[PDB]
Structures are given as structure tokens and as C-alpha cells.
Amino acid sequence: GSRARVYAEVNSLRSREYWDYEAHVPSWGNQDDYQLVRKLGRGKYSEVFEAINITNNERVVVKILKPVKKKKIKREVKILENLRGGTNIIKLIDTVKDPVSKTPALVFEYINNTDFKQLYQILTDFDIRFYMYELLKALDYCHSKGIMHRDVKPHNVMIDHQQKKLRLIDWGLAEFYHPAQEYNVRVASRYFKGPELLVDYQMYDYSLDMWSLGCMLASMIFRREPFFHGQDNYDQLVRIAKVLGTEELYGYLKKYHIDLDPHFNDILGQHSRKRWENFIHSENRHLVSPEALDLLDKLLRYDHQQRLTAKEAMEHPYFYPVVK
Ligand SMILES: Nc1ncnc2c1ncn2[C@@H]1O[C@H](COP(=O)(O)OP(=O)(O)NP(=O)(O)O)[C@@H](O)[C@H]1O
Ligand SMILES: [Mg+2]
């Protein structure tokens, strides 16, 4: 068994209506109130548009949802409503359907994002501290609201660098945390999956997001992006073990009584834990500091329980320059 060290019982302390998303009934407005101007994003068969609300001339974003079960739409909508107004959470403005096809769509506030592949190349140490702190505010908020994001990665973090503004987007994988609940391990994107997912441990919690955040921090300070670049979900665990060490992996598995599938033993091999300083070289030295490495070491830990919480991370010395 396992439970979150923070915010474990919050949902049980709230009204059932808060977390019982299957009982939520969205009101679907008419998408003809929205003029779709420009397709946003890099790809992945995405259907996200810059739009203008024709009734008030406000710029928004319309995300047309691919065919999915109503239950998953209700979950995302309810989570977005519960988080509305939270620090650095994207704001859901409306839920609409095209009046002909009846396809549902979500209307969001617009943020003038710069794609991370371009932005991360020009960030300074200070900027990485600043944006990581802003992202932690969003995660502490959602965790405090009983929700795990489950898909933290650069692609889901919108940053307007000129206005120093950040929003955490794409709540389609998010889920309410309930102690002892067994969750689907088919969440997050490969490079950002925590070890718990890769070894099929279902009793995970908010700390999954803190692994993903650590992966982001590592890529930002070291400039190896993604940081753990598995060729498939099995090799993903090997890439982690080559850094954190194999003995430490088997200690984690023992603690939680996790049986590693036997095929893993041959590919895992034997690896000592690496010092994080080993990743420093001339291309990243101006982004790395002892404080950054200490924080990173406290995020990227096999044992999900031992990872820093979002609030603990916000209190780390790495963020002293950006707290005030
Ligand atoms: N509120 C927004 N403002 C500006 N751009 C946005 C906004 N929401 C989404 N985008 C852009 O649309 C892209 C895709 O958004 P996203 O919600 O992640 O779609 P998706 O199809 O679900 N991708 P995935 O992360 O694989 O699930 C983002 O990476 C942005 O480029
Ligand atoms: Mg996304």
C-alpha cells in the first residue's frame, strides 16, 4: 500500500459533487459563436485553434475534442471547473458543440506561447528558476484541490516569455486522488513517465507529477531534451536506471512489494548511481548550480513517497531568487 504525504484526504472532506464527475452535466453552447482563425500547435493531429468570440470580439482558444467517451469529457470539464481561478491553471471559458456535427469542443483563455524548443534555448538560470516556480504554483494548487495532472511535460506548459506568464494546460489525463485507489498506469508521455508507471504500480499519487517536473528541470538545466530518452516503455526504465542505479531500483521494488516482470532483468543490467554533476559540460554549465542539482536529486527518486511535494520544492534554496 501507499498514500500521498500531503493532501491525501482532501477530496473526502469535500462535497461528493466536487469529485463525482460522472454526475456532472455540462451545458453545451453553440460553437457558431466562435470564429476559428488560426491553427495553433506543432502537430499530433491536433485541432486547437485561435478563435474570436463573435459576440464580444474576445480572442480565445477552441480545442475540438476527438471522439471519446462522455465520461472522459465530463472528467476533464469538471476538473477544469474545479481548478478555475487557480494560480497558473488554464481557464476554461466555455463548453460548446458545432451545431451540425455535434462535436464537442472546449473554449479556453488564450496565451501567447512560444514553443519550448525555441524558448528553452534562450533561458538563463534565473529564467529556469522563475518558470519552474510558476509551474510549481500550479501543481501545488491542483494537488491541494485533490487532482493529479498526469501529463506534465514541456508541451503542456504554455509560456509567454515577454510577459513572464505561464499556464499549465491539457487536463485530459488528470484524475482525482483518492487514497488506496488503483489508477491506470497508461498515463503521461513516455519520457516523463515515473518509474511507478513503468513497473505497473497502480497506487500512485500527486508525486507522479513531481517526477515529470524533475524530468523537465533536468532537460532545462542540462539541455538534454528529453532527459531520459527511452526507445520504448521498457528501455525508458533502463534509461532511468542508468542514472539512478539498479540497486536503488531493486530497493524501491522491495519496499512496495513490486514484482518486476522477468524480461527486465537482462535489459536493466547493473548500473551504479551517477552523480548529477556528471551531466555538466561546457554547453550547460551556466545553467547548473549546486542548488539546482540538490533540488533535482530530491525530485528524481524512484520512491514516489520520498520525492519532494510541490510545496516542499517551492521552499528549496534554488528558488530563493524568485520567491519575492
Ligand atoms: N490556451 C492555449 N493558448 C495557446 N495555445 C494553446 C492553448 N491550448 C493549447 N494550445 C496550443 O495547442 C497545442 C496542443 O494543445 P493540447 O491541449 O496539448 O492538445 P492535445 O491534442 O491534447 N496534445 P497532447 O498533449 O498530446 O494530449 C499546445 O501545445 C499549444 O501549441
Ligand atoms: Mg497536450
Confirm or reject: Cβ of 169 under 6 Å from ligand 1: yes
| All structural domains of the chain with their residue ranges | 1-19+111-324, 20-110
Which residues make beta-bridge pairs with 157?
168
Pairing of strands 147-148, 92-97: unpaired
CA distance 265 to 241: 12
- Location of C-alpha cell 536506471: 241
Is the distance from CB of 271 to CB of 237 less than 8 angstroms? no
CATH superfamily of 20-110: Phosphorylase Kinase; domain 1 (3.30.200.20)
CB of 65 shorter than 6 A to ligand 1: no
Other C-beta atoms lying within 10 Å of the C-beta of residue 300? 23
Residue 146 among known ligand-binding residues: no
Residue nearest to atom 28 of ligand 1 (CA): 41
Residue pair 168/89 in contact by the 8 Å Cβ criterion: yes
Q: Would the CB of 159 count as within 6 Å of ligand 1?
A: no
Q: How far is CA 238 from the centre of its chain?
A: 22
CATH number of 1-19+111-324: 1.10.510.10
Q: What angle do CA 122, 128, 129 make, to 5 degrees?
A: 150
Of 173, 178, 183, whose CA–CA distance to 203 is shortest? Answer: 183
- Dihedral sign, Cα of residue 299, residue 208, residue 90, residue 117: positive
Distance of alpha carbon 151 from alpha carbon 153, whole angstroms: 6
Nearest to 265 by CA among 242, 238, 239: 238
Residues 34 and 62 sit within 8 Å (Cβ to Cβ): yes
Ligand 1 centroid distance, CA of 249 (Å): 34
Atom of ligand 1 at shortest range from CA of 167: 1
98 neighbors 107 (Cβ within 8 angstroms): no
Residue 9 CB partners (closer than 8 Å, separation 6+): 179
Task: Enumerate residues 6+ apart whose C-beta is below 8 A from 139.
Answer: 149, 152, 168, 206, 209, 210, 213, 310
Cβ proximity of 224 and 209 under 8 Å: no
Angle at 149 between CA 147 and CA 155, to 5 degrees: 160
Annotate 80-141 with DSSP letters as a single string: HHHHTT-TTBPPEEEEEE-TTT--EEEEEE------HHHHTTT--HHHHHHHHHHHHHHHHH
The Cα–Cα gap between 152 and 146 comes to: 16
**Ligand 1 pocket member 222 (CB < 6 A):** no
Rounded-to-integer distance, Cα 227 and Cα 161, Å: 23
- Cβ(108) – ligand 1 distance below 6 Å: yes
d(CA 97, CA 102): 5
Q: How far is the CA of 105 from the centre of ligand 1 (A)?
A: 13
- Here the cell at position 259 is 514484482
Residue 237 marked ligand-binding: no
Give CA–CA dist 85/223, Å, rounded: 33
CA distance 152 to 154: 7
Atom 18 of ligand 1: nearest residue by CA position: 170
Place of cell 522563475: 130
Instruction: Find the discontinuities in the chain where C to next N exceeds 2.5 angstroms and give the residue preceding each.
Output: none
SS3 230: coil
The minimum-distance atom of ligand 1 relative to the CA of 109 is: 1
Of ligand 1's listed atoms, the one at least distance from the Cα of 66 is 21
CA distance 12 to 146: 9
Place of cell 515515473: 194
Residues acting as catalytic residues = 151
Exposed/middle/buried for residue 109 (C-beta within 10 Å: 0-12, 13-18, 19+)? middle
- The distance in angstroms from the start CA to the end CA of the chain is 39
DSSP string, 155-217: GGEEEETTTTEEEE---TT-EE--TT----S--S-GGG--HHHHTT-----THHHHHHHHHHH
Please identify which residue in the block is written with the cell numbers 475540438: 64
Which of 33, 37, 36, 15 lies closest to 24, judged by CA? Answer: 15
CB neighbours of residue 313 within 10 Å:
24
Helix (H, G, I), strand (E, B) or coil at 28: coil
- ∠ CA 232-235-238, nearest 5°, is 155
Minimum-distance ligand to the CA of 41? 1
- What is the length of the chain? 324
Q: Determined by which method?
A: X-ray
Resolution (A): 1.0
Rounded Cα gap, residues 276 and 298, in angstroms: 11
